[PDB]
Every structure is written in C-alpha cells, then in structure tokens.
Amino acid sequence: MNLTELKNTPVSELITLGENMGLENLARMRKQDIIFAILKQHAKSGEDIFGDGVLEILQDGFGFLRSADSSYLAGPDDIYVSPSQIRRFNLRTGDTISGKIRPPKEGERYFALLKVNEVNFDKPENARNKILFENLTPLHANSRLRMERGNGSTEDLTARVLDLASPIGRGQRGLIVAPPKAGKTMLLQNIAQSIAYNHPDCVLMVLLIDERPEEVTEMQRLVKGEVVASTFDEPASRHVQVAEMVIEKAKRLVEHKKDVIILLDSITRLARAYNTVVPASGKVLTGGVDANALHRPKRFFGAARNVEEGGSLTIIATALIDTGSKMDEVIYEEFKGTGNMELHLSRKIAEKRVFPAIDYNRSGTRKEELLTTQEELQKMWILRKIIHPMGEIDAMEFLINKLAMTKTNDDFFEMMKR
Amino acid sequence: MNLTELKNTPVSELITLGENMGLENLARMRKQDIIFAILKQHAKSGEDIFGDGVLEILQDGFGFLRSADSSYLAGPDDIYVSPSQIRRFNLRTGDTISGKIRPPKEGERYFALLKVNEVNFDKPENARNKILFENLTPLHANSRLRMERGNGSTEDLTARVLDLASPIGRGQRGLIVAPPKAGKTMLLQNIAQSIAYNHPDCVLMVLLIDERPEEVTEMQRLVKGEVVASTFDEPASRHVQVAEMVIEKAKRLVEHKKDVIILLDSITRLARAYNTVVPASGKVLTGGVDANALHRPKRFFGAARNVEEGGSLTIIATALIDTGSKMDEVIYEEFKGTGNMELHLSRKIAEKRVFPAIDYNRSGTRKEELLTTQEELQKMWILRKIIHPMGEIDAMEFLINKLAMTKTNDDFFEMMKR
Amino acid sequence: DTYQPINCDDYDNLELACQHHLMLTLELKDGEKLQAKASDLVSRKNVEYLVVEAAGETRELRLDKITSFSHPEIGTVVVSES
Amino acid sequence: DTYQPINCDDYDNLELACQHHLMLTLELKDGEKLQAKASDLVSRKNVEYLVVEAAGETRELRLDKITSFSHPEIGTVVVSES
C-alpha cells in the first residue's frame, strides 16, 4: 500500500480498509484525519510504509514533495524533506522521489521523508551523476512524430490534415495561432490522443492555465497521459508555480534520456499571469505589459529542444488572437517568430463549420527536410504548389474530401497525382 | 592549466577531470561552476593558471575579463581586474587580455588577475601607444572582398550571384533586406564560409540577436571564425551587452591595423532590444519607437569604415521587413539610407523556391568603381543593362541558368559576350 | 553483500549534533567510552565516511560500521532496519 | 636593464597604501632598509616609477628594485621575480 493508492482510492474501499484493519472511528468525512490515524497505526505496528512525490525547493531551504493528482497543489499530505537530504542527494525542483516515509512527529504538520529508494525511476547513485539540462547541446528536430493513425474514422481526419500541413518532430518548438472560437480544444485533445496512441514511450504532459473545471475534468478523463491544470478562480501565483512544476519535471525527465511532450493551453494566459505577478520595473511598454514580464514565459517556451546527447522536449503551445485586448496582441507579437513549427487557425473556416479550421497557406515548419523523406518532401511540394495560388477555405474542402475516401497518406498522394 | 582549453573541453570530460582531482557531485550544476571549482582545486596545489578574456569595464570602474565561449555571459569564471590595473595599462572595453590568474582570497568571490603578458595580441607596452578608433579618418572602400570561391560547387553559385549584384570591399556598410521565408540564414552562412575560405587573415565575428538555440548551435558548428549569440529567452540587457562587447572588440582589433568583419542577424532585433532597455525620452514615434533609442544602433552601424591607415571594419547586417509589426517598418525607414551596400531578398522569388532569392534590379553598391577594375565594371554594367527589363523571378531563373555551366565569373562574362 | 544507505532521520540528528558543536561521547566495539567530537561527514565515492580525532589518531570509519549513537541533549536514536 | 611589470597584487597593495598614506617599511634589492612614505605612483618612459619621501627626500626608484614591503596593519608581501 502506497500513499497515492489511498489518495486516489474512493470512499467505500478506504472505509472497508479502515473497518477491517481495526479503525475505531469511521464516521469522519475528512479523509486527511482518517489517513493520518491509519498511518499512525501502521507506524505503531512497525510495518514499513512507502510513498512518492515531486520535489519543490522553497527559497528558505527545505523541500516539499507535492502530488500531481492535486495538480501540484500545496496540502497537509505533502511530504517534508529536510535540506540535509537535499545536500546528500543532488535533488532540485522537478525530481520525483519514491521511498520510505516517516509519520509526522510532535512539531510536524507534514509527513517527514524517511528513506529514498528511487529518484526519477532510477537509483540515487545513478541519478546523482546526470548532466544538467542546459549543458546539453540543442539541435534541430530530425525524427518526426507520426500522428497518422490506422483508425480511419473522422477523428483521424484532423490528425492526417495536421500531418500533411506541418510535420511535428520530437524536440520541436510549436505554436498554434487561434481565434477565440475555432474548436481549439478538440484539436488539442486529438493531438494528445494521437501522441498517446502512437508513441507510448514519449512522456505526454498536458497543462491548462485559467480554464473552467468542466473541461479540466473532461481532459483528465479523456487524455491518457498526465493532465495538470489551474482553474480560473485561482490567482496568478498558482499558475506560475504550476508552470514551474511542469517545466522542472520535464527538464529532469529529459536529463535521463527521455522524450517529454508538453501541450500548453495557453501561452497567452501563462504570460498574463506572469505579467500580473512580476513587480513593476518602472517602465511599461504599450498595452500595459511590463518589459521583463515576458522574460519568464520566453524561458518556458525556449526550453523546448532536441538534445544531441539523448532525449527531446517538444513544447506545443496555443496562442489566442483577436481576443479584444491589445495586451494579448502584443504578447503574441513578442511570441511571434520563436517557434519552429507554426499552425494558424482561421475564424472564417470555423464559422463555415469545416473541421479542422487550419490555414494551409499560413502554416508549416522551419525544416521539413530533416523530418520527412525525399519523395514525401516532393509530394508536399506538389500539394503546396497546388493549394497556395488559390483560396484557403475551398482548399480545405478540397483537402478533406480528398482524404475522405482514402485511408493512407501515400494512397492520397498517389490519387492527387494525374 | 590554461582556462581557455578548460572552457573548450566538453562537459563529460570536465566531470571526469574534476572527479579525478577529488571534487564531489560536480556533474549536476552549471559548467561555469564546474570550471570554477576545478580551478580552485588546482590553485590550492600552488600551480600557476593561465587565462585570457575580453575586458568589460563596469560603471563602478573595475573590469571583468569575460570569455567568448559563453558569449560574454557573466559567470563565476570571469576574471576580475581592479581599477588600479586599468589605470596602469590604458585598458578600454573590448581589450583581449591574456595572463596569469590567482585564486580569490578571503572575502573575494571572483578570480583575480596576477600578471599581464599579452594585451590585444601584442605586448602590454606596445598596445598602450595605439591611436583611438574614431581618430582614424574614414575612407571609401577600395579593397575588394571576393566571395567567389571558384570551386564550381552548387553552394558557390549564391556567392557568385552576390558578387554580381553587390560587391563588398573592406570597411563596407551593408544592409540585407530580408522578407521572412527567404533564405537569409543560408545567405549568411554562405557569406561566412566564403569569407573564411577566401580571406583567412580577416578576423570574422558572427553576431546573432534573439536567435533560437538550435540556430546558434548550428552556426557555431558551421562558421570557422567567431560566433557569439544571445537566445531570445534572455533579457534585452543581454543583447545590448553582447552587441557592445562585439563592437568594442572589433574597434580594438582595428586599432591594431587588422581587418575585421561582423555579420549581424539582425539589426532590427538589436534596435528592438535597445528600445526596450533605453528609457523613454518623451518623444515616442509611431509603433512605440523612441527617437532616443535608435541613436545607439545607428552608432553600431556607423562604426563600419575603411580606415585611412592600415585596417578596416566591415559590417553586414540583415534587416527584416514584411513582419507585420510597425516597429520593424519604422526601424527600416530609419536605417534605409545609411548603408554603402544594399542587397534585397525577395519573398515572391522564394515562393517559386529557387535560390538565392535575391532581387537584382533593386540591389547594388555605392561607388563600386573603387572596388572593381575597369573591365569588370564595364562587364557588370553590360549585364545590368541586359537584366533590367526582366522581372525578378525571370531575372533570377535566367541568371542561375546562365551561371550553371560557367565555373568562374570571367568565364561567365566571356560566355555572355558571345 | 549489498550496501544500503542509512536512514535520513539518524543522519540528520548526527549532522545537527555536528552543527551544534557540542561535546561528544563515543563508544568502541569493546564498549570503551571516550570524550571527543566528530568533525565532519565526508562523502567520498558515494559513500559516507567519518574521521575521528579523539587521541589524534585521525582514524577513518565507514558510516555503516557504527551500531548507534546517543547524546545527552537529544533523545538516543536507534537505527531502523529499513 | 629592461624593466618587467610587477605582479598585480604587489602593485594593488602599493596603490592602496599610497592612497591611504601609510608609513611604509621598505627593503631594497641591495638590502637598503628605510621607513618613509610613498606619495604617488608615477610611470615615466614606459617604466613604472615610485617616489618615496622621508623628510622631503622624495627619492625616485623603479618598482623592480623593491623586494618586500610591510606595515603594522598589513602583511609583509614579497614580490614575485617571475
């Protein structure tokens, strides 16, 4: 039995566990007290108890192991770790620690770490000798993530269109230009589904900033990978700390030769939160945004890279345009040309109810030659030559009805010829 | 040992060397911290340490020798020179000083210089008696820098085409107008490699502002000379500091009668950074541009000159247009009539996807009779007269067709003669 | 056979005792009591070592070769099996 | 006799003493011992000189000739011949 196992366990089975183990009181709705009592009783029996968490290093010096289930929210159940253990094992923000956990003593609101047996799915001795993330040399994306599934349903249509318009590779910095109503959430959901289905080895992470709880719940239910989010009612500091959590965890995972994928909806909201939290520097540029406010969102966006030594970090971020606020427009302008792949969404195509509503003539990647092969590159050249001179919405109708009766992109490429 | 080679070794070799000498857990922090720790450990043994760096004098008066491998980024490994030594040897910012270092004493954080034995690649005494840069009288460029390699490769074609469009002399002042998609980076890489091959004696530095990390890495790999860059995630003060370090180093090198070449990508982003950092003067032009802010990028661009005495300083800076932002359009309108050489790239030529995407009819040089001989000048005039009626796409296709079989420029002129 | 690291609790107690820089009572295998102070815990080759200057011998010992340690300021500690 | 620059530490300490006006205890290369005050560090003909005055003697010497210098409040620093 592990702390997270009791954490995600619902009421009936935990009540049964308490009553069969010998708990005196089971009429307490607050799960924290019953978990505390049952863990105290396990400690009294001398039976060892394990746990897991994600490290946060506070500026004062000690660390707190948060949980991803609560979207990395502070709570009484987070595991306290003293600075001595941080000095022993070289552990920074984002590391995942699993090991023995000691019950709180008199003077501790939080459970104190007892003994670590695994760090980042690795022994501490081997986890202490990994090079830092920014010492790794960046590279262009050379291996591509194929999102064309064999399902052949209408869901695969969006994936095939995205594969054709702009290939995606591991280690790619992506940007999604989008109007307020273009069905962006469906696009993100199918992208995540394709990523989880096609490349299980790659760690998929979805993070939402300033979103209503209903879509947060539906995403947590429907996305196979981890889903972390912050509701709109929470202040900006919550968004800042959750973004720091996800980026540090991604960096620590990448250091261990792992491919990490982060879907960010949206960069505009994260930049808004960062602007609202940072103290003013005395000079404000046009639009009521601070010059140094964008620096940390830029650092978050720029962490995406394809590490030469091993692993990759693919950050795909969504951007909101014509939202009525000029500060969002200037935020997008300083986030204009820093992404390797770009995908523009058109409001008019959304109005015409054509799914997906992407813009072929305004989308594409910086280096299509590395990701694709030769004949694939020539076929994409031919398709772009066909589509570019004429319109875009009618071009999209052409594309969707051409992919209608076909299943494989190669068959469609054969059909588009002659 | 020598600090420069230590900075040149990869991270894994640094970790191995440090673990050899007894340092512990040094594989999990900054490379600068690793270098500082191993240097301190070696200096504890009592051996002398040799190191070099470019001097930056701060507002207080003391200076720091910074290395160019980290693009002059501040770090623990930077050497510290007290104001007494800047008084001893008349040292200005941009001076490349090499000598011995001593370990920091109690209460000191940075390594301190011990004895100077090379200033600006010369003796400490001789470098004191060099005339300042702006006292030298500028001149019109007359020593041609030929970009044509003459090996007949398809990579040479671009250079050849460029030599036909706008020749460059020593001490020129070039502006490469660049629409977004057109292959500006390919042009810059071709120019840098041609300069490295044809003219090895000229000191070549490549400066990149707001560039993506993968582009910076590929440029450091490709360019034989010197590459210093600032990624887009860094603040504007970083861009300003790297630009001023580059320009002062170039000025100090020219003071010693040396040809210096600076390829800049791009002047627009440098101007944006300068606008961000410089406080507003109260007279804000259209697009948020401050009139005071443009003063310093103009100094950077106007520092390019052909010194009457020995030496020259060539600056070829690209400028982006059709970016959808009024800031860049205003910067272009400010910088349009200040360059000796003007080379235009065309978006619609790259639409047909032929390279290079250079607009012949709108690209040229000022006082081109000085660089080239009379016969070559008359041949160039004849070709310009032939080219003028045709449109830019047709012009480029016809030029590339005629430039294929010919190996050198003289053979091309001979073929065009009959 | 395998080497297991010591638990974090006793390690943090002993490093706290080192930080307080108090007087120390040490025992040997035969039970001899000595009055000295453990200076610092040195982590070499991913292994903790303790040097002792009780009689100037400056003897080096491995952290897994000590049964338990007791101090008067805090409660005596017992090394857990896990 | 060509002049070689002295080490940075020696010159920095000399300049600090000069601008702080201490009764510097000086020993010469030939062994001359003298208690006097250094007024200013001046370089003439590319060789750095030093003027030291005792009762207005204001005698000039090269920095290479000085081997060591001392004061009550600062440590005695021996210059490096190499």
Side-chain angles (χ1 to χ4, degrees), chain D residues 28-64:
Chain D
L28 195 44
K29 195 72 62 200
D30 83 328
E32 200 271 343
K33 170 50 216 167
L34 205 183
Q35 194 76 36
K37 199 214 95 51
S39 39
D40 168 37
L41 270 178
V42 49
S43 55
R44 323 182 200 267
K45 185 272 301 173
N46 250 0
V47 47
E48 292 178 325
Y49 275 102
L50 159 56
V51 54
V52 195
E53 67 272 14
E57 67 143 89
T58 71
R59 184 220 30 71
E60 201 29 55
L61 76 166
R62 283 165 61 167
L63 271 307
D64 189 358

mmCIF file of all heavy atoms in Angstrom, chain D residues 28-64:
data_model
loop_
_atom_site.group_PDB
_atom_site.id
_atom_site.type_symbol
_atom_site.label_atom_id
_atom_site.label_comp_id
_atom_site.label_asym_id
_atom_site.label_seq_id
_atom_site.Cartn_x
_atom_site.Cartn_y
_atom_site.Cartn_z
ATOM 1 N N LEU D 28 65.201 47.306 0.111
ATOM 2 C CA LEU D 28 65.666 47.381 -1.265
ATOM 3 C C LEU D 28 66.239 46.037 -1.717
ATOM 4 O O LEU D 28 66.497 45.137 -0.914
ATOM 5 C CB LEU D 28 66.714 48.489 -1.401
ATOM 6 C CG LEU D 28 67.098 48.990 -2.795
ATOM 7 C CD1 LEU D 28 65.856 49.184 -3.646
ATOM 8 C CD2 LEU D 28 67.900 50.278 -2.706
ATOM 9 N N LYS D 29 66.426 45.905 -3.034
ATOM 10 C CA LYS D 29 67.073 44.715 -3.577
ATOM 11 C C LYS D 29 68.496 44.579 -3.052
ATOM 12 O O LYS D 29 68.936 43.478 -2.701
ATOM 13 C CB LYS D 29 67.074 44.765 -5.104
ATOM 14 C CG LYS D 29 67.382 43.437 -5.772
ATOM 15 C CD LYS D 29 66.223 42.469 -5.625
ATOM 16 C CE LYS D 29 64.974 43.000 -6.308
ATOM 17 N NZ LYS D 29 63.739 42.353 -5.787
ATOM 18 N N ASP D 30 69.230 45.691 -2.993
ATOM 19 C CA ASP D 30 70.576 45.687 -2.435
ATOM 20 C C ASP D 30 70.584 45.514 -0.923
ATOM 21 O O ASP D 30 71.660 45.325 -0.346
ATOM 22 C CB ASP D 30 71.302 46.979 -2.814
ATOM 23 C CG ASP D 30 70.972 48.128 -1.882
ATOM 24 O OD1 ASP D 30 69.830 48.176 -1.376
ATOM 25 O OD2 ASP D 30 71.853 48.983 -1.655
ATOM 26 N N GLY D 31 69.426 45.578 -0.273
ATOM 27 C CA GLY D 31 69.345 45.429 1.162
ATOM 28 C C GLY D 31 69.111 46.706 1.934
ATOM 29 O O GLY D 31 69.133 46.673 3.170
ATOM 30 N N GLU D 32 68.887 47.827 1.253
ATOM 31 C CA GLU D 32 68.650 49.083 1.952
ATOM 32 C C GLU D 32 67.302 49.047 2.661
ATOM 33 O O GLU D 32 66.274 48.729 2.059
ATOM 34 C CB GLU D 32 68.703 50.254 0.970
ATOM 35 C CG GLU D 32 68.959 51.603 1.624
ATOM 36 C CD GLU D 32 67.679 52.297 2.046
ATOM 37 O OE1 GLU D 32 66.597 51.902 1.562
ATOM 38 O OE2 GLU D 32 67.754 53.240 2.862
ATOM 39 N N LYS D 33 67.317 49.385 3.946
ATOM 40 C CA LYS D 33 66.131 49.415 4.786
ATOM 41 C C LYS D 33 65.760 50.863 5.079
ATOM 42 O O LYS D 33 66.601 51.658 5.511
ATOM 43 C CB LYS D 33 66.382 48.650 6.092
ATOM 44 C CG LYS D 33 65.313 48.800 7.162
ATOM 45 C CD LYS D 33 63.921 48.558 6.618
ATOM 46 C CE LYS D 33 62.924 49.478 7.293
ATOM 47 N NZ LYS D 33 61.632 49.490 6.568
ATOM 48 N N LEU D 34 64.493 51.210 4.841
ATOM 49 C CA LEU D 34 64.100 52.603 5.009
ATOM 50 C C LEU D 34 62.628 52.723 5.399
ATOM 51 O O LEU D 34 61.762 52.020 4.862
ATOM 52 C CB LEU D 34 64.403 53.376 3.719
ATOM 53 C CG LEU D 34 64.642 54.895 3.683
ATOM 54 C CD1 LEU D 34 64.853 55.352 2.244
ATOM 55 C CD2 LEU D 34 63.554 55.727 4.340
ATOM 56 N N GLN D 35 62.343 53.616 6.345
ATOM 57 C CA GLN D 35 60.987 53.943 6.772
ATOM 58 C C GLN D 35 60.615 55.292 6.167
ATOM 59 O O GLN D 35 61.148 56.328 6.578
ATOM 60 C CB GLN D 35 60.898 53.981 8.296
ATOM 61 C CG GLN D 35 59.486 53.991 8.841
ATOM 62 C CD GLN D 35 58.830 52.632 8.767
ATOM 63 O OE1 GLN D 35 59.485 51.606 8.943
ATOM 64 N NE2 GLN D 35 57.529 52.616 8.507
ATOM 65 N N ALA D 36 59.702 55.281 5.200
ATOM 66 C CA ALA D 36 59.307 56.505 4.514
ATOM 67 C C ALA D 36 57.903 56.322 3.952
ATOM 68 O O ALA D 36 57.293 55.256 4.079
ATOM 69 C CB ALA D 36 60.310 56.874 3.420
ATOM 70 N N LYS D 37 57.393 57.380 3.327
ATOM 71 C CA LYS D 37 56.032 57.427 2.811
ATOM 72 C C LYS D 37 56.059 57.568 1.296
ATOM 73 O O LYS D 37 56.808 58.391 0.758
ATOM 74 C CB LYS D 37 55.258 58.592 3.434
ATOM 75 C CG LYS D 37 53.747 58.478 3.333
ATOM 76 C CD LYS D 37 53.112 59.848 3.159
ATOM 77 C CE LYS D 37 52.872 60.165 1.694
ATOM 78 N NZ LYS D 37 52.149 59.058 1.013
ATOM 79 N N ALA D 38 55.246 56.766 0.614
ATOM 80 C CA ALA D 38 55.103 56.854 -0.833
ATOM 81 C C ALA D 38 54.003 57.851 -1.174
ATOM 82 O O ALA D 38 52.859 57.697 -0.734
ATOM 83 C CB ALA D 38 54.783 55.484 -1.430
ATOM 84 N N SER D 39 54.350 58.870 -1.960
ATOM 85 C CA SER D 39 53.413 59.945 -2.271
ATOM 86 C C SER D 39 52.530 59.610 -3.473
ATOM 87 O O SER D 39 51.303 59.736 -3.399
ATOM 88 C CB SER D 39 54.174 61.255 -2.503
ATOM 89 O OG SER D 39 55.374 61.030 -3.216
ATOM 90 N N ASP D 40 53.133 59.187 -4.583
ATOM 91 C CA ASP D 40 52.361 58.871 -5.776
ATOM 92 C C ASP D 40 53.107 57.847 -6.620
ATOM 93 O O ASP D 40 54.340 57.809 -6.633
ATOM 94 C CB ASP D 40 52.068 60.132 -6.601
ATOM 95 C CG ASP D 40 51.517 59.817 -7.978
ATOM 96 O OD1 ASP D 40 50.734 58.852 -8.098
ATOM 97 O OD2 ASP D 40 51.870 60.529 -8.941
ATOM 98 N N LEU D 41 52.339 57.017 -7.327
ATOM 99 C CA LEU D 41 52.875 56.030 -8.257
ATOM 100 C C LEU D 41 52.817 56.619 -9.662
ATOM 101 O O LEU D 41 51.732 56.758 -10.240
ATOM 102 C CB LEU D 41 52.090 54.724 -8.173
ATOM 103 C CG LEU D 41 52.597 53.695 -7.161
ATOM 104 C CD1 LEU D 41 51.695 52.472 -7.140
ATOM 105 C CD2 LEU D 41 54.030 53.303 -7.477
ATOM 106 N N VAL D 42 53.979 56.961 -10.209
ATOM 107 C CA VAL D 42 54.078 57.639 -11.494
ATOM 108 C C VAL D 42 54.957 56.816 -12.424
ATOM 109 O O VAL D 42 55.999 56.290 -12.022
ATOM 110 C CB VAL D 42 54.631 59.075 -11.334
ATOM 111 C CG1 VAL D 42 55.885 59.069 -10.476
ATOM 112 C CG2 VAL D 42 54.906 59.710 -12.693
ATOM 113 N N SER D 43 54.522 56.694 -13.675
ATOM 114 C CA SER D 43 55.256 55.958 -14.693
ATOM 115 C C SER D 43 55.854 56.938 -15.693
ATOM 116 O O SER D 43 55.130 57.749 -16.278
ATOM 117 C CB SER D 43 54.347 54.955 -15.410
ATOM 118 O OG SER D 43 53.200 55.594 -15.942
ATOM 119 N N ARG D 44 57.170 56.863 -15.884
ATOM 120 C CA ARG D 44 57.878 57.695 -16.847
ATOM 121 C C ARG D 44 58.647 56.806 -17.814
ATOM 122 O O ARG D 44 59.314 55.858 -17.390
ATOM 123 C CB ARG D 44 58.837 58.665 -16.150
ATOM 124 C CG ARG D 44 58.328 59.226 -14.832
ATOM 125 C CD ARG D 44 59.322 60.217 -14.244
ATOM 126 N NE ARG D 44 59.127 60.429 -12.814
ATOM 127 C CZ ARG D 44 58.384 61.396 -12.294
ATOM 128 N NH1 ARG D 44 57.755 62.272 -13.059
ATOM 129 N NH2 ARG D 44 58.272 61.489 -10.971
ATOM 130 N N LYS D 45 58.561 57.130 -19.107
ATOM 131 C CA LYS D 45 59.253 56.397 -20.173
ATOM 132 C C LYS D 45 58.935 54.901 -20.070
ATOM 133 O O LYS D 45 59.814 54.049 -19.959
ATOM 134 C CB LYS D 45 60.762 56.710 -20.144
ATOM 135 C CG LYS D 45 61.701 56.147 -21.253
ATOM 136 C CD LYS D 45 62.304 54.766 -21.017
ATOM 137 C CE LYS D 45 63.128 54.730 -19.739
ATOM 138 N NZ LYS D 45 63.585 53.351 -19.401
ATOM 139 N N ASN D 46 57.641 54.592 -20.011
ATOM 140 C CA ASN D 46 57.072 53.247 -20.044
ATOM 141 C C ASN D 46 57.535 52.344 -18.904
ATOM 142 O O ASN D 46 57.082 51.197 -18.830
ATOM 143 C CB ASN D 46 57.352 52.528 -21.372
ATOM 144 C CG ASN D 46 56.106 52.365 -22.215
ATOM 145 O OD1 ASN D 46 55.018 52.789 -21.823
ATOM 146 N ND2 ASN D 46 56.252 51.741 -23.376
ATOM 147 N N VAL D 47 58.410 52.809 -18.019
ATOM 148 C CA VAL D 47 58.847 52.036 -16.862
ATOM 149 C C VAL D 47 58.240 52.676 -15.622
ATOM 150 O O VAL D 47 58.463 53.859 -15.343
ATOM 151 C CB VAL D 47 60.378 51.947 -16.772
ATOM 152 C CG1 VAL D 47 61.024 53.302 -16.981
ATOM 153 C CG2 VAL D 47 60.789 51.389 -15.419
ATOM 154 N N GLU D 48 57.452 51.897 -14.885
ATOM 155 C CA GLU D 48 56.750 52.428 -13.727
ATOM 156 C C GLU D 48 57.734 52.781 -12.622
ATOM 157 O O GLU D 48 58.571 51.964 -12.228
ATOM 158 C CB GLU D 48 55.721 51.415 -13.227
ATOM 159 C CG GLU D 48 54.559 51.199 -14.184
ATOM 160 C CD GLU D 48 53.586 50.151 -13.690
ATOM 161 O OE1 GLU D 48 54.039 49.168 -13.067
ATOM 162 O OE2 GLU D 48 52.371 50.309 -13.927
ATOM 163 N N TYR D 49 57.626 54.002 -12.125
ATOM 164 C CA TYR D 49 58.491 54.531 -11.084
ATOM 165 C C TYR D 49 57.689 54.709 -9.794
ATOM 166 O O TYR D 49 56.470 54.526 -9.765
ATOM 167 C CB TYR D 49 59.123 55.846 -11.540
ATOM 168 C CG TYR D 49 60.383 55.695 -12.356
ATOM 169 C CD1 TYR D 49 60.366 55.832 -13.736
ATOM 170 C CD2 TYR D 49 61.598 55.433 -11.739
ATOM 171 C CE1 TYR D 49 61.522 55.703 -14.479
ATOM 172 C CE2 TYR D 49 62.757 55.303 -12.472
ATOM 173 C CZ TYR D 49 62.714 55.438 -13.841
ATOM 174 O OH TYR D 49 63.870 55.307 -14.575
ATOM 175 N N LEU D 50 58.392 55.072 -8.724
ATOM 176 C CA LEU D 50 57.750 55.305 -7.437
ATOM 177 C C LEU D 50 58.585 56.317 -6.669
ATOM 178 O O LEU D 50 59.807 56.167 -6.569
ATOM 179 C CB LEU D 50 57.614 53.998 -6.645
ATOM 180 C CG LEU D 50 57.436 54.065 -5.126
ATOM 181 C CD1 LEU D 50 56.234 54.919 -4.740
ATOM 182 C CD2 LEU D 50 57.315 52.669 -4.537
ATOM 183 N N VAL D 51 57.925 57.340 -6.132
ATOM 184 C CA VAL D 51 58.577 58.390 -5.359
ATOM 185 C C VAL D 51 58.250 58.176 -3.888
ATOM 186 O O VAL D 51 57.076 58.091 -3.505
ATOM 187 C CB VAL D 51 58.166 59.793 -5.842
ATOM 188 C CG1 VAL D 51 56.654 59.958 -5.844
ATOM 189 C CG2 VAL D 51 58.821 60.860 -4.977
ATOM 190 N N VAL D 52 59.291 58.054 -3.070
ATOM 191 C CA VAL D 52 59.150 57.840 -1.636
ATOM 192 C C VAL D 52 59.912 58.945 -0.921
ATOM 193 O O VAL D 52 61.088 59.185 -1.217
ATOM 194 C CB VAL D 52 59.668 56.453 -1.212
ATOM 195 C CG1 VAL D 52 59.188 56.116 0.182
ATOM 196 C CG2 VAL D 52 59.219 55.390 -2.200
ATOM 197 N N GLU D 53 59.246 59.615 0.017
ATOM 198 C CA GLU D 53 59.810 60.775 0.691
ATOM 199 C C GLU D 53 59.920 60.523 2.189
ATOM 200 O O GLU D 53 58.988 60.001 2.811
ATOM 201 C CB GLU D 53 58.977 62.033 0.415
ATOM 202 C CG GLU D 53 57.582 62.037 1.017
ATOM 203 C CD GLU D 53 56.552 61.398 0.106
ATOM 204 O OE1 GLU D 53 56.952 60.713 -0.860
ATOM 205 O OE2 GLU D 53 55.342 61.579 0.357
ATOM 206 N N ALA D 54 61.077 60.866 2.746
ATOM 207 C CA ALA D 54 61.311 60.919 4.182
ATOM 208 C C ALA D 54 62.022 62.231 4.474
ATOM 209 O O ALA D 54 63.160 62.430 4.034
ATOM 210 C CB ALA D 54 62.143 59.730 4.661
ATOM 211 N N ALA D 55 61.348 63.122 5.204
ATOM 212 C CA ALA D 55 61.830 64.487 5.430
ATOM 213 C C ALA D 55 62.057 65.215 4.105
ATOM 214 O O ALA D 55 63.003 65.991 3.955
ATOM 215 C CB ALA D 55 63.097 64.501 6.289
ATOM 216 N N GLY D 56 61.180 64.960 3.137
ATOM 217 C CA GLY D 56 61.231 65.665 1.866
ATOM 218 C C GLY D 56 62.303 65.186 0.913
ATOM 219 O O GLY D 56 62.681 65.924 -0.003
ATOM 220 N N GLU D 57 62.810 63.965 1.100
ATOM 221 C CA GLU D 57 63.838 63.453 0.199
ATOM 222 C C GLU D 57 63.262 63.119 -1.175
ATOM 223 O O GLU D 57 63.915 63.354 -2.198
ATOM 224 C CB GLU D 57 64.533 62.246 0.839
ATOM 225 C CG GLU D 57 63.667 61.014 1.021
ATOM 226 C CD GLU D 57 64.412 59.720 0.773
ATOM 227 O OE1 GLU D 57 65.007 59.186 1.733
ATOM 228 O OE2 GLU D 57 64.391 59.225 -0.369
ATOM 229 N N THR D 58 62.039 62.581 -1.216
ATOM 230 C CA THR D 58 61.286 62.382 -2.462
ATOM 231 C C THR D 58 62.097 61.619 -3.507
ATOM 232 O O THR D 58 62.070 61.933 -4.699
ATOM 233 C CB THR D 58 60.801 63.718 -3.029
ATOM 234 O OG1 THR D 58 61.916 64.455 -3.547
ATOM 235 C CG2 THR D 58 60.112 64.540 -1.949
ATOM 236 N N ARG D 59 62.825 60.604 -3.057
ATOM 237 C CA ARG D 59 63.691 59.851 -3.952
ATOM 238 C C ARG D 59 62.887 58.922 -4.856
ATOM 239 O O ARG D 59 61.860 58.363 -4.456
ATOM 240 C CB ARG D 59 64.735 59.087 -3.137
ATOM 241 C CG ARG D 59 65.766 58.318 -3.939
ATOM 242 C CD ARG D 59 66.052 56.961 -3.296
ATOM 243 N NE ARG D 59 64.916 56.400 -2.572
ATOM 244 C CZ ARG D 59 63.815 55.923 -3.139
ATOM 245 N NH1 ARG D 59 63.664 55.914 -4.448
ATOM 246 N NH2 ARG D 59 62.841 55.450 -2.366
ATOM 247 N N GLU D 60 63.367 58.776 -6.090
ATOM 248 C CA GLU D 60 62.718 58.014 -7.147
ATOM 249 C C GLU D 60 63.366 56.643 -7.282
ATOM 250 O O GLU D 60 64.594 56.525 -7.228
ATOM 251 C CB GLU D 60 62.829 58.744 -8.491
ATOM 252 C CG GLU D 60 61.796 58.334 -9.527
ATOM 253 C CD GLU D 60 60.504 57.865 -8.908
ATOM 254 O OE1 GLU D 60 59.922 58.628 -8.116
ATOM 255 O OE2 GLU D 60 60.100 56.713 -9.154
ATOM 256 N N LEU D 61 62.548 55.604 -7.457
ATOM 257 C CA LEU D 61 63.096 54.276 -7.703
ATOM 258 C C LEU D 61 62.169 53.483 -8.612
ATOM 259 O O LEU D 61 60.977 53.769 -8.733
ATOM 260 C CB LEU D 61 63.323 53.485 -6.407
ATOM 261 C CG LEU D 61 62.138 52.859 -5.667
ATOM 262 C CD1 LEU D 61 62.661 51.870 -4.639
ATOM 263 C CD2 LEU D 61 61.237 53.881 -5.006
ATOM 264 N N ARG D 62 62.744 52.468 -9.250
ATOM 265 C CA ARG D 62 61.966 51.529 -10.037
ATOM 266 C C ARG D 62 61.284 50.514 -9.125
ATOM 267 O O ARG D 62 61.763 50.200 -8.031
ATOM 268 C CB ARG D 62 62.857 50.809 -11.049
ATOM 269 C CG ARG D 62 63.216 51.647 -12.262
ATOM 270 C CD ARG D 62 64.377 51.038 -13.030
ATOM 271 N NE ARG D 62 64.061 49.709 -13.537
ATOM 272 C CZ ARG D 62 64.790 49.056 -14.431
ATOM 273 N NH1 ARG D 62 65.882 49.589 -14.955
ATOM 274 N NH2 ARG D 62 64.413 47.838 -14.812
ATOM 275 N N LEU D 63 60.146 49.997 -9.588
ATOM 276 C CA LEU D 63 59.407 49.002 -8.822
ATOM 277 C C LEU D 63 60.094 47.644 -8.796
ATOM 278 O O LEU D 63 59.839 46.858 -7.876
ATOM 279 C CB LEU D 63 57.991 48.847 -9.382
ATOM 280 C CG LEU D 63 56.917 49.774 -8.808
ATOM 281 C CD1 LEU D 63 56.899 49.691 -7.290
ATOM 282 C CD2 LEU D 63 57.123 51.208 -9.268
ATOM 283 N N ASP D 64 60.952 47.350 -9.774
ATOM 284 C CA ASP D 64 61.674 46.083 -9.775
ATOM 285 C C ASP D 64 62.648 45.991 -8.609
ATOM 286 O O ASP D 64 62.900 44.895 -8.096
ATOM 287 C CB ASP D 64 62.416 45.910 -11.101
ATOM 288 C CG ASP D 64 63.011 44.525 -11.264
ATOM 289 O OD1 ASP D 64 62.889 43.704 -10.331
ATOM 290 O OD2 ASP D 64 63.611 44.259 -12.327
#
